[PDB]
Design a protein around this ligand. Sequence first.
Ligand code: CL
Ligand code: CL
Ligand code: CL
Ligand code: CL
Ligand code: CL
Ligand code: CL
Ligand code: CL
Ligand code: NA
Length: 129
Amino acid sequence: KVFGRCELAAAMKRHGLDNYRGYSLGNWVCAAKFESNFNTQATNRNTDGSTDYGILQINSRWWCNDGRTPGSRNLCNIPCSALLSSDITASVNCAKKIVSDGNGMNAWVAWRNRCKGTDVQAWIRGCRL
Ligand SMILES: [Cl-]
Ligand SMILES: [Cl-]
Ligand SMILES: [Cl-]
Ligand SMILES: [Cl-]
Ligand SMILES: [Cl-]
Ligand SMILES: [Cl-]
Ligand SMILES: [Cl-]
Ligand code: NA
């Protein structure tokens, strides 16, 4: 599924991400825009053989099982395919574990490089929330 901007902001708020670990909703929308262009089916292969999955490009090295990332963990206890659903629940529940891990949203390199310190409230401007 390709979300609209406000549609995704609403879905993320309904699943309890707004101000999760202190990160306002626009931070999560901005991260989704630059990780996936709001496409739940986005995948990207890394040089190390791990793969990033879904709207927040969650990596198989630590967070999900894809059966092709040797020596990896599955800390969200999900198949990586769950992260490609039209239903963002699994992506949201896993992102909550990642952002609690110690480095906050710096875990998302696109958020650090493209969202951090910017006017992220722009990403939810106009939305009925
Ligand atoms: Cl947009
Ligand atoms: Cl915001
Ligand atoms: Cl594996
Ligand atoms: Cl594990
Ligand atoms: Cl699995
Ligand atoms: Cl959803
Ligand atoms: Cl933090
Ligand atoms: Na894994």
